[PDB]
Design a protein around this ligand. Structure first.
Ligand SMILES: O=C(O)c1ccc(C(=O)OCCO)cc1
Ligand SMILES: [N+]
Length: 259
């Protein structure tokens, strides 16, 4: 029995559903928090199944947490703590956004409310980011290799080599992305990840740079599965990740299955 498994046995319908089995409560964190510009914590109300893991979600260049708000109720209702954060300034670079993703996770572990702290397993943390926040997601794993998962969403970064990343990384790219072209960003990041790293690359057909900013079932179903598999060690979700998904919305998928 996995001590981290939460919720009933999943199906493809359950991971695609807009609402998971857990009721969600929210809390506002002031932007004057140390190390980052505040945000909103989405946590499950139910507590009788055990403490949950947490993921901090970073926005892109000049964007706020509102561009990532739909991940809050979507992911947290499946049994996770979600921290959609704002950066110190809207002009922050990927390297700075990686530091503030860690500062957001440290706030959850060290200085969070007792409603949040009681529901948090501080040993199982993850990061997720959009574009420049996706570059900061890669940065956060190099800065903290003890992280359990990492999901760069249409990532943007000047550094193309990530052969020292030790955290399971799930890169999602948009085929028609011209701001962070997958040929020069998303794919070079994935191919430079260690060949032995538990990694995956999902390219969405005909998607643009800001597709992760609105509800997307294809993004939602496999972001949930990736967090479940590596933050919860929940092998009940390995069926959705290995072998490679065959969704019509996916134009290309690469992975190092089995995990
Ligand atoms: O012009 C760029 O280099 C550049 C432009 C935009 C971004 C970015 O993070 O897009 C997401 C904003 O919501 C990254 C780099
Ligand atoms: N595919």
């Amino acid at each position: 029995p996995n001590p981290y498994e939460r919720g009933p046995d999943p199906t493809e319908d359950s991971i695609e559903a807009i609402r998971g089995p857990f009721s969600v409560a929210t809390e506002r964190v002031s932007s004057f928090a140390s190390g980052f510009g505040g945000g909103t914590i989405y946590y499950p109300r139910e507590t009788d199944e055990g403490t949950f893991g947490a993921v901090a979600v970073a926005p892109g260049f000049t964007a706020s947490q509102g561009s990532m708000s739909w991940y809050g109720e979507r992911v947290a209702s499946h049994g996770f703590i979600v921290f959609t954060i704002d950066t110190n300034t809207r002009l922050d670079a990927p390297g700075q956004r990686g530091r503030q993703l860690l500062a957001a996770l440290d706030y959850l572990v060290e200085r969070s409310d007792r409603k949040v702290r009681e529901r948090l397993d501080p040993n199982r943390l993850a990061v997720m980011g959009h574009a420049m926040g996706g570059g900061g997601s890669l940065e956060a794993t190099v800065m903290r290799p003890s992280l359990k998962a990492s999901i760069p969403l249409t990532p943007w970064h000047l550094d193309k080599t990530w052969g020292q990343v030790q955290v399971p990384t799930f890169i999602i790219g948009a085929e028609l992305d011209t701001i962070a072209p997958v040929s020069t960003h998303a794919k070079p990041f994935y191919e430079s990840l260690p060949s032995s790293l538990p990694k995956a690359y999902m390219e969405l057909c005909g998607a643009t740079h800001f597709a992760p900013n609105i509800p997307n079932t294809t993004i939602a179903k496999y972001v949930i599965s990736w967090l479940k598999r590596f933050v919860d060690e929940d092998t009940r979700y390995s069926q959705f990740l290995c072998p490679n998904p065959t969704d019509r919305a996916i134009c290309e998928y690469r992975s190092t299955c089995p995990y």
